[PDB]
Amino acid sequence: TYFYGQGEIDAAPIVNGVLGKWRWIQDVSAMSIQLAVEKVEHKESYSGQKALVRSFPIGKTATVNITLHSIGPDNLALTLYG
Amino acid sequence: TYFYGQGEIDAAPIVNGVLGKWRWIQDVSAMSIQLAVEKVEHKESYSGQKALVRSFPIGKTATVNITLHSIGPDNLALTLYGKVVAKAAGSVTGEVLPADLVAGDVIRLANFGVSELVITDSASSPAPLDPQYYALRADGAYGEVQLLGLPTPAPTQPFKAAYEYAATKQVGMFTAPQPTVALRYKGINLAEGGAPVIVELYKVATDPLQELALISDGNTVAGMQISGGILLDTSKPDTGDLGRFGRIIQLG
Amino acid sequence: PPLGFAALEERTWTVSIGTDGPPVVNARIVWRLQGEPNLVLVITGNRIIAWTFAPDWGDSIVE
């Protein structure tokens, strides 16, 4: 029930919605995934305490950061838009 | 009269207001409660100073932050807005592998925990391929199969793979609505010889995880930080001294 | 409507007023019987719908 992860990452380019051929992205040192959500809050005033009473999410997004140490031409094409 | 708290935390989902079944949130490293109050001020001017004379609070909100180190599927569902999926172990008989296969290619199976892998050649007379012509990377933990070689009389290219897969638990992303969970903390105060202390939060709305370092560097266990705001529960009595956000119990 | 009344019998109907109709209630129900002048029961009033939405108040309400 504890996490300390190491391993491999594989990527498959997506062209016009058809799955490509997967390849290894070579050595990778760090991967992190971040979740962001926007919320609109509803409050009720009967108590006189002017405090939050309800909240419903509106926005939903996720971002991934990857740190790779490989300068291989395939990875260069992936990262340099080349 | 001094506090240094350690203990456990219990959470019960709220689904349409009916109390759920309490569950342990496993190991936790940090819990913090923050209170924010907004005030509107009235200033007199009869003394020539225009100094603050009165102020009444208008805002009131409480935020709770929890750091948990458990990657249990229940906690993933509670934190990733997901719902757990259980797949029972089974077998496959007629999976078709990609065509135009040659040595050096890697094949991926739809299921994990593959064992007893057999690849039958496509022909009028079935002829299972020799095991030495393929290898299982990561002991079949991902169905990754690597081709070591092919017989000189190249057999029929399409393959039919059969094997067994183990049961697993899966959690989706943003597949569940905003959970509403009541929290019960079980801090034991060491500064007073281990004096029991209770904290209950009637209604809390959590916020999805901010960061998750899948690959970690150092000697630190991966940490999961969750933020949530304590909502105002409308079911408890208004005049009741127990309040509507939470309360603290200290035996004595 | 055709209803025979027994002697020394009172028949109290249940006048159910619904929530759907024109905003102005201009009704003239006629209780017409033989050998008796028309006894019209006139029902008058208005139909209104109440605002049952709780508005958020993070911004002060201005009166």
UniProtKB/TrEMBL annotation, chain A:
<protein>
    <recommendedName>
        <fullName>Virion structural protein</fullName>
    </recommendedName>
</protein>
UniProtKB/TrEMBL annotation, chain C:
<protein>
    <recommendedName>
        <fullName>Virion structural protein</fullName>
    </recommendedName>
</protein>
